Short mmCIF file of C-alpha atoms in Angstrom, two decimals:
data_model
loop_
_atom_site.label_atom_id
_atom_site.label_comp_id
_atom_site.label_asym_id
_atom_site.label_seq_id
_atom_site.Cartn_x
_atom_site.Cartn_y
_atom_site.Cartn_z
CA UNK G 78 47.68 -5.39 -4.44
CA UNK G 79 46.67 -9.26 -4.36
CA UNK G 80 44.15 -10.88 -6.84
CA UNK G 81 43.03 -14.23 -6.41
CA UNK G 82 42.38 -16.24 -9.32
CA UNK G 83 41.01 -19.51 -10.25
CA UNK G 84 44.31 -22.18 -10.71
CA UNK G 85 42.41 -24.02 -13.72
CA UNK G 86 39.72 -21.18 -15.01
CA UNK G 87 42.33 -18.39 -14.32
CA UNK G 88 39.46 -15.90 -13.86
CA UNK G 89 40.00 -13.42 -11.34
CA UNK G 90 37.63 -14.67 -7.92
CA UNK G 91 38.80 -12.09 -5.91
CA UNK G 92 41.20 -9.35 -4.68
CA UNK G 93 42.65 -8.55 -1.27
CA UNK G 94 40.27 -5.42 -0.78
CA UNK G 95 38.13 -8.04 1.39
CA UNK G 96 38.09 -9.22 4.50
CA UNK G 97 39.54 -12.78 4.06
CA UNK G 98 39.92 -15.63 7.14
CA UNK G 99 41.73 -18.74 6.71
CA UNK G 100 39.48 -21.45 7.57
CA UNK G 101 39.30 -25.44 7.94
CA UNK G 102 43.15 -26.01 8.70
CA UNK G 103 44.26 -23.41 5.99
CA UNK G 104 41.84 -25.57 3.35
CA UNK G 105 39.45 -22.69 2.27
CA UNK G 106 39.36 -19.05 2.22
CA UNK G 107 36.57 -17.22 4.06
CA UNK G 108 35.50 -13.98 1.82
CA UNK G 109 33.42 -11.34 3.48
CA UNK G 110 31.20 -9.61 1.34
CA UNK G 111 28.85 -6.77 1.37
CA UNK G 112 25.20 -6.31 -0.34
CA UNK G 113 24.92 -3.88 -2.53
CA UNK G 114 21.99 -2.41 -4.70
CA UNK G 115 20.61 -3.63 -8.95
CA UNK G 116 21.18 -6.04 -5.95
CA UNK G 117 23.59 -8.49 -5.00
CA UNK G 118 26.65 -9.37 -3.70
CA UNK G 119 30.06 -7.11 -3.76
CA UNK G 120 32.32 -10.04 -4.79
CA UNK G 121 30.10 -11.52 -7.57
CA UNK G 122 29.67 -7.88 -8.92
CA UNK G 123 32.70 -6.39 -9.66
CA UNK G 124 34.63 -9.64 -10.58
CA UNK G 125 32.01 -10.51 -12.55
CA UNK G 126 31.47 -13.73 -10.92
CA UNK G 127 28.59 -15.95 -12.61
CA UNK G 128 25.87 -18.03 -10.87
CA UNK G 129 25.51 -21.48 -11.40
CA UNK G 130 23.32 -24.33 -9.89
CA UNK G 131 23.54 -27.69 -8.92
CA UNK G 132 21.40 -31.19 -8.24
CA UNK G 133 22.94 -32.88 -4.97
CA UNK G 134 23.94 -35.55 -7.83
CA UNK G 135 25.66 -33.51 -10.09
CA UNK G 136 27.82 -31.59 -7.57
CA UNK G 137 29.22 -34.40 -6.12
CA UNK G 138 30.40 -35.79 -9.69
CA UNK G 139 31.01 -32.12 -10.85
CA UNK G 140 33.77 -32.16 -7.42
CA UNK G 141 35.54 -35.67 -7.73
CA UNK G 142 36.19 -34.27 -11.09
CA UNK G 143 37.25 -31.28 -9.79
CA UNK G 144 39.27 -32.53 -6.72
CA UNK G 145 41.89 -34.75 -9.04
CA UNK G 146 42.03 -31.64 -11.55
CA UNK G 147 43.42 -29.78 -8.60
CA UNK G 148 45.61 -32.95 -7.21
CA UNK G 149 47.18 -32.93 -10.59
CA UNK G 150 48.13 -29.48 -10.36
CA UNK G 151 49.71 -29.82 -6.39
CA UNK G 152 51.79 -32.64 -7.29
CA UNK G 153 53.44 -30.49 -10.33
CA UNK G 154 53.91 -26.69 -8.14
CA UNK G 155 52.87 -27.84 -4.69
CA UNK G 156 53.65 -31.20 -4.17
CA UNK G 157 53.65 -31.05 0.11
CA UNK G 158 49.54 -30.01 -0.27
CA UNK G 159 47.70 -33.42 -1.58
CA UNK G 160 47.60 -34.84 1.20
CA UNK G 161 46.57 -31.77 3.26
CA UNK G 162 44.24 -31.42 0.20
CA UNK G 163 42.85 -34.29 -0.38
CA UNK G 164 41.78 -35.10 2.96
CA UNK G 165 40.38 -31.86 4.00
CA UNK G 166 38.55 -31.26 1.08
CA UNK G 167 36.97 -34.58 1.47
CA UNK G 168 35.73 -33.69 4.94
CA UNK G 169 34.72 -30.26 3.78
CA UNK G 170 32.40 -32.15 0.52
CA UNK G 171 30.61 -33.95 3.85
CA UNK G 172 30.28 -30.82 5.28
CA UNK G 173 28.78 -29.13 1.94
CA UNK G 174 26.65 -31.71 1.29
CA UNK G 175 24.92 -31.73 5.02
CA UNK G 176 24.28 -28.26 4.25
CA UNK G 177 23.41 -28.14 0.85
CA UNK G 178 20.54 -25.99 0.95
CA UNK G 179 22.09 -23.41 1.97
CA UNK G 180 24.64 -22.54 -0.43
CA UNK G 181 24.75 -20.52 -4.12
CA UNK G 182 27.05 -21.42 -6.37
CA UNK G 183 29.19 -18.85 -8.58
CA UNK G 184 31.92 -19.44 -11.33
CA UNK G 185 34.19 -17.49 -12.87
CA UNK G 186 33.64 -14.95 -15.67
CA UNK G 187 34.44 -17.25 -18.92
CA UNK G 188 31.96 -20.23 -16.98
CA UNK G 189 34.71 -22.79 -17.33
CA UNK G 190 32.81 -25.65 -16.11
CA UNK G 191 36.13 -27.45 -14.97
CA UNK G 192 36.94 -24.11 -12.43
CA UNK G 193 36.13 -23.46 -8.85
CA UNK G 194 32.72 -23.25 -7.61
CA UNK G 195 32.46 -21.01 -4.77
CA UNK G 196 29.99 -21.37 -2.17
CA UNK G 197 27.82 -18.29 -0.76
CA UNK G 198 26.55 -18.07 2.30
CA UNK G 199 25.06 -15.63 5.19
CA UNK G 200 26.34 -15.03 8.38
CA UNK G 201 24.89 -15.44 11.92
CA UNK G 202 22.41 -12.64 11.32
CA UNK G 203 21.14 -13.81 8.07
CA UNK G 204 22.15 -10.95 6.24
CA UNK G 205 26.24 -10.71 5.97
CA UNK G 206 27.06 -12.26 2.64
CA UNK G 207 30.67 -14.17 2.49
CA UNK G 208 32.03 -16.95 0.41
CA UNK G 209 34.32 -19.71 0.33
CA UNK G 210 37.12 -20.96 -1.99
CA UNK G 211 39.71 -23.71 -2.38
CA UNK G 212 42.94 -22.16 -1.17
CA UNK G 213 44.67 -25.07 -3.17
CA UNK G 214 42.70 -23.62 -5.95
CA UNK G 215 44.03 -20.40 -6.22
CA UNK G 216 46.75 -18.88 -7.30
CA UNK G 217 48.02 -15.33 -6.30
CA UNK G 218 48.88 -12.52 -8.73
CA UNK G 219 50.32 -9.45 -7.39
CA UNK G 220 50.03 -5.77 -9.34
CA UNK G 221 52.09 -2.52 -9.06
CA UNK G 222 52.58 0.29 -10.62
CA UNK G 223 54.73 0.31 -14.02
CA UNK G 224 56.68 2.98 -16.37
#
């Protein structure tokens, strides 16, 4: 099986035992996620993913930061994404932003400050939970069986 995992942080974010859509030109992955009750969210629970919050201030300072950490990274493995990157992402921080209010943040397990911060948010009817990555920020680790 596929497990996602944070490209700085290298936390585990998620695995593919979730619905995931490719959205915003192949930018960000769309994670669909499932409540579950002690409530919360499927995702966050069994990958042990941490909330986090943010001032409109400090997340825009917190993702410059993190933006060139991930640049650095492209131009070493994935050289043909910065620009795809880089652009994208800075339309998508617009689009964040506008909707700021409506967004939790979550971390990896070991809280690296420096790792992704993805974004939760409900569906349509206000009561589907699904979240959104980097794809640029993950890296893909794949599992089988062993003797």
């Amino acid at each position: 099986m596929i497990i996602y995992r944070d490209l700085i942080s290298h936390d585990v974010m998620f695995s593919d035992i979730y619905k995931i859509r490719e959205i915003a030109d192949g930018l960000c992955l769309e994670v669909e996620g499932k409540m579950v009750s002690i409530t919360g969210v499927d995702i966050v629970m069994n990958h042990h993913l941490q909330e986090t919050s943010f001032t409109k201030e400090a997340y825009k300072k917190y993702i410059k930061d993190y933006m060139k950490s991930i640049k650095g990274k492209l131009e070493e493995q994935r050289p043909e994404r910065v620009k795809p990157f880089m652009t994208g992402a800075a339309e998508q921080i617009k689009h964040i932003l506008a909707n700021f209010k409506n967004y939790q943040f979550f971390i990896g397990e070991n809280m690296n400050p420096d790792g992704m911060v993805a974004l939760l948010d409900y569906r349509e009817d206000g009561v589907t939970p699904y979240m959104i990555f980097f794809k640029d920020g993950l890296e893909m680790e794949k599992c089988l069986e062993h003797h």
